């Protein structure tokens, strides 16, 4: 009805950092408690993301969904005025973020920890000795891709720790650290040692992998072998005239329709659960956007 957030600073902020916080005007950040008055320690994503600690993006990306989300409205030396996001209210939002990926109605906006860089997304407050980590918001497919890049680099790092170095290292960091868009390349900051909770997510996915690997339909494998032998598509670009060895020995049995029907049914029940697993983030649907004003009308 009247979502109103005012956050009180204990001491006045310096004459430099008031300008930097004015540069951050109009931006989503998650806050701790749903109250009109908040202390600055609860505000922002500062407390869980430490410069001293190895960054766990999965821990951040869990933490942000737990917080209710908000939008900055007024920056003063004494207090910060923010409005809050209720699930069933429609808001005017302006894209002021420094990477600037073009937004469209096609994707729901997704909010992520600042995977790209550390320092530039954050503002230090030595007047009240706390740090504000603004989240980074992105459209849907880039967010899905970056989460995929992070988990794949987690897996290949844990593999490559006792593998050969220079060849496997200099092959992996090609087009995994860097995401390439129209006219641009950008370097993801990836953790050096993945230890908490990313591997737990990968374990959860491997559970579904081990269950699904038994119930695969055979005729689709036959169709893939016949297609890669006879014809070519961009779907078939990865397979040349060579066929991988596994598929023939899974293939050797004949086709019975009811078995593939049951396998398709069980896999059909499972993929919806996987679709539940992949999200892990607050998704805000976009219904209107003006490029000339960089202004969307979110939901």
């Amino acid at each position: 009805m009247d979502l109103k957030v005012v956050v009180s600073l204990s001491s006045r902020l310096y004459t430099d950092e008031i300008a930097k916080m004015q540069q951050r005007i109009g931006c989503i950040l998650p806050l701790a408690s749903t109250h009109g008055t908040q202390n600055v320690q609860g505000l922002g994503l500062g407390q869980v993301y430490s410069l001293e600690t190895v960054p766990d993006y999965v821990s951040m990306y869990n933490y942000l969904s737990d917080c209710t989300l908000a939008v900055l409205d007024e920056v003063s030396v004494d207090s910060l005025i923010l409005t809050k996001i209720v699930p069933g209210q429609t808001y005017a939002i302006k894209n002021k973020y420094q990477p600037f990926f073009q937004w469209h109605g096609t994707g729901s906006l997704s909010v992520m920890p600042p995977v790209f860089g550390r320092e530039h997304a954050t503002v230090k407050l030595e007047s009240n000795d706390v740090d504000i980590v603004f989240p980074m918001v992105l459209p849907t497919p880039i967010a899905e891709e970056v989460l995929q890049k992070i988990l794949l680099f987690n897996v290949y790092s844990r593999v490559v720790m006792q593998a050969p170095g220079n060849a496997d290292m200099l092959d992996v960091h090609m087009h995994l650290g860097s995401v390439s868009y129209l006219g641009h390349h950008y370097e993801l900051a990836l953790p050096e040692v993945p230890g908490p909770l990313g591997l737990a997510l990968l374990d959860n996915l491997s559970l579904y992998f081990c269950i699904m690997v038994t119930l695969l339909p055979r005729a689709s494998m036959r169709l893939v072998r016949g297609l890669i032998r006879h014809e070519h598509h961009d779907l078939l670009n990865l397979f040349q005239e060579m066929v991988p060895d596994e598929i023939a020995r899974i293939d050797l049995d004949d086709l019975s329709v009811a078995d593939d029907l049951s396998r398709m049914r069980v896999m059909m029940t499972y993929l919806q659960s996987l679709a539940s697993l992949f999200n892990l983030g607050p998704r805000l649907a976009t219904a209107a956007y003006s490029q000339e004003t960089l202004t969307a009308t979110c939901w």
């Binding site: 009805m1 009247d2 979502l3 109103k4 749903t34 009109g36 209720v86």
Partner: protein, 50 residues
């Protein structure tokens, strides 16, 4: 109970409950008071928060 090669010192901290006296001279702080606001929000199906 044989003495080791070294001696040792101990450091402790303690907390004492104190009923305190505050003195303040006349007219030391000027205060600005504003109109109070009352707002409503986030109506539950059986409740409303103010």
């Amino acid at each position: 109970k044989i003495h080791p090669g070294v001696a040792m010192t101990v450091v402790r901290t303690d907390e004492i409950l104190s009923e305190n006296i505050l003195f303040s001279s006349r007219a030391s702080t000027s205060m600005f008071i504003g109109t109070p606001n009352v707002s409503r929000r986030e109506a539950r199906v059986d409740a409303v928060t103010f």
